[PDB]
């Protein structure tokens, strides 16, 4: 039986642990945190993620989709909130088969842990990887107190997140060609209780957006009708705009309240614990990190956030990590040896990770910033109706299909260009020749 050591019992790590263990690999999974399935008296908080077709299909292959969806809230569309006008629902797809799912991250992680164990993987909690000795094939782990434990390894999988200790250890034996692109927005999580969301008629089956240009709020629903609100706002005000809003300007919860009352007036009354949430929840950091190399021979490989940290504006990080887990398990199971498997996995996934990193950055402007956008979406829906095998909106290709991200981006660019060309030199949708637009669709978009 082939052996594997996995670092990080997160989303990618647990899924790959289940896929390999059920194929008869001897799997040992090391996690820095305590086991979340061990109930304590700690007062934790609900953070949700949007599960889309790539993540759902990965869970489906693993036999866990039904269990995960049983506690997921359907999000049919984008509910855009602008003060003065009623909230506008922009459906994501053609029917209720084309939806995204709001899932509690802790619940998903617990289902995945149970799944990896049921398949035969051994999970070891309260052990954080500190260092790897590649030449001696040993690694060093420790608990929070720094008590060390050394282990031998044969194959090392770094599924240890955006601040990966496996990636740090690899970067010492090989130049990973790491390129970091910091993102100016920080993020803060705030809560809407079930009573408040019901009082203010906040739609549970939608992903909510309060656009505001350089900053915005989003809200994802929970099963109990509470919502997690995420504020995206610059850490610091730029030199050109010193008066522009930023986290640096919000000294306390009371300052955050004044900011919401002024900039998000329809949202502030729903946030009862705004002051406390603001002061007690830390401001998170965002970034895009691109690596030239994801593996060291046949000894170690990275996947998920460990391999490709991305900005969260497409809700695709977990979806991409679960898709990586499937690809990695497939390559490892069927290759001639581990070195061939790692080289083939990296060659396959690197162009796709780059495409989703680029599309995630582009989706920020789409969410936070229009009459022309709605006219291009209008013409795009007509083109999707006339040619459903050639014209598939980029959001639908990313979210509802398993088309490689790089192909979704490439086809998306052709579509963006033709929509922009047709909506140019025309005031209304009635002056645009639809048959002419349909002709460049047939000329430049091959069918799928």
Ligand X SMILES: Cc1cc2nc3c(=O)[nH]c(=O)nc-3n(C[C@H](O)[C@H](O)[C@H](O)COP(=O)(O)OP(=O)(O)OC[C@H]3O[C@@H](n4cnc5c(N)ncnc54)[C@H](O)[C@@H]3O)c2cc1C
Select from 55, 304, 317, 412 the one that contacts Cl ion (CB under 5 A).
Answer: 317
Does the annotation list 104 as a binding residue? no
Q: Does 312 bind Cl ion (CB under 5 A)?
A: yes
Q: Give the strand order in the sheet containing 148-152.
A: 128-133, 138-142, 148-152
- Here the tokens at position 255 are 């300052």
* Burial (CB count within 10 angstroms: exposed 0-12, middle 13-18, buried 19+), residue 424: exposed
Select from 220, 256, 342, 375 the one that contacts ligand 8EQ (CB under 6 A).
Answer: 220
Could you tell which of ligand 8EQ, Cl ion, ligand X, none binds residue 5, using a CB distance below 5 to 8 A set by kind? Answer: none
- Here the tokens at position 366 are 């789409």
Distance CA 96, CA 231 (A): 28
- By beta-carbon proximity to ligand X, the closer residue of 383 and 398 is 398
Q: How far is CA 74 from CA 111, 205, 313, in A?
A: 19, 5, 19
Least distance from ligand X to the Cβ atom of residue 109, Å: 7
- Here the tokens at position 442 are 């047939």
Least distance from ligand 8EQ to the Cβ atom of residue 417, Å: 5
Number of residues that bind ligand X (CB under 6 A): 32
Closest CA to 32 of 15, 8, 13: 8
Does the annotation list 22 as a binding residue? no
Least distance from ligand X to the Cβ atom of residue 55, Å: 6
Q: Does 17 bind ligand 8EQ (CB under 6 A)?
A: no
Select from 4, 16, 18, 30 the one that contacts ligand X (CB under 6 A).
Answer: 30
Distance CA 219, CA 277 (A): 15
* Burial (CB count within 10 angstroms: exposed 0-12, middle 13-18, buried 19+), residue 90: middle
Does the annotation list 11 as a binding residue? yes
Least distance from ligand X to the Cβ atom of residue 446, Å: 28
Q: Does 272 bind ligand 8EQ (CB under 6 A)?
A: no
Q: Does 7 bind ligand X (CB under 6 A)?
A: yes
- Helix residue ranges, H only, 264-370: 274-280, 317-334, 338-368
Q: Does 59 bind ligand 8EQ (CB under 6 A)?
A: no
For residue 52, the Cα-to-chain-centroid distance in whole angstroms is: 10
Q: Do residues 294 and 302 lie in contact, with contact meaning Cβ atoms separated by under 8 Å?
A: yes
Q: Does 321 bind ligand 8EQ (CB under 6 A)?
A: no
Q: Does 222 bind ligand X (CB under 6 A)?
A: no
Longest dimension (CA), the chain: 73
Residues forming contacts to ligand 8EQ in the complex (CB under 6 A) are 9-10, 31, 33, 36, 47, 50, 78, 100, 105-106, 109, 113, 207, 218, 220, 230, 312-315, 363, 366-367, 417-418, 421-422, 433, 436-437, 440
Residues forming contacts to Cl ion in the complex (CB under 5 A) are 312, 317
């Amino acid at each position: 039986a082939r052996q594997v050591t996995i670092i990080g019992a997160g989303l990618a790590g647990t899924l790959v642990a289940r896929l390999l263990a059920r194929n008869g690999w001897q799997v040992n999974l090391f996690e820095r945190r305590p086991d979340p399935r061990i109930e304590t008296g700690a007062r934790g908080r609900s953070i949700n993620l949007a599960l889309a077709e790539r993540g759902a299909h990965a869970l489906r292959l693993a036999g866990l989709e039904r269990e995960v969806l049983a506690e997921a809230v359907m999000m049919r569309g984008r509910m855009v909130h602008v003060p003065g006008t009623p909230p506008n629902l922009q459906p994501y797809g053609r029917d209720d088969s084309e939806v995204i799912w709001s899932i509690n991250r802790d619940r998903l992680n617990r289902i995945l842990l149970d799944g990896a164990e049921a398949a035969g993987a051994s999970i070891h909690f309260n052990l954080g990887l500190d260092s790897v000795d590649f030449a001696r094939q040993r690694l060093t782990l420790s608990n929070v107190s720094g008590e060390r434990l050394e282990k031998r390894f044969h194959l090392l999988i770094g599924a240890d997140g955006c601040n990966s200790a496996v990636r740090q250890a690899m970067a010492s034996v090989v130049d990973l060609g790491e390129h970091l692109e910091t993102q100016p927005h920080g993020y803060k999580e705030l809560q809407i209780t079930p009573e408040a969301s019901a009082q203010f008629n906040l739609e549970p089956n939608a992903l909510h957006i309060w656009p505001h240009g350089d900053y915005m709020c989003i809200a994802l629903p929970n099963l109990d009708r509470s919502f997690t609100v995420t504020l995206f706002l610059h850490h610091q005000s730029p030199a050109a705009q010193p008066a522009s809003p930023s986290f640096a300007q919000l000294v306390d919860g009371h300052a955050a309240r004044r900011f919401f009352q002024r900039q998000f007036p329809d949202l502030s009354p729903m946030l009862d614990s705004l002051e406390q949430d603001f002061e007690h929840h830390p401001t998170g950091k965002l970034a895009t990190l691109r690596l030239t190399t994801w593996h060291v021979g046949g000894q170690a490989v990275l996947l998920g956030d460990a391999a490709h940290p991305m900005v969260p504006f497409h809700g695709q990080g977990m979806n991409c990590a679960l898709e990586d887990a499937v690809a990695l398990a497939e390559h490892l199971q069927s290759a001639a040896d581990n070195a061939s498997a790692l080289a083939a996995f990296t060659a396959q996934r690197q162009p796709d990770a780059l495409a989703i990193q680029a599309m995630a950055l582009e989706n920020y402007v789409e969410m936070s910033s229009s009459p022309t956008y709605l006219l291009e979406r209008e013409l795009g829906q007509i083109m999707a109706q006339r040619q459903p095998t050639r014209f598939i909106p980029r959001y639908s290709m990313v979210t509802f299909s398993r088309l490689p991200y790089a192909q979704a981006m490439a086809r998306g660019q052709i579509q963006e260009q033709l929509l922009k060309f047709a909506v140019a030199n025309h005031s209304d949708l009635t002056s645009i020749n639809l048959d002419a637009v349909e002709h460049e669709v047939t000329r430049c978009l091959p069918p799928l």
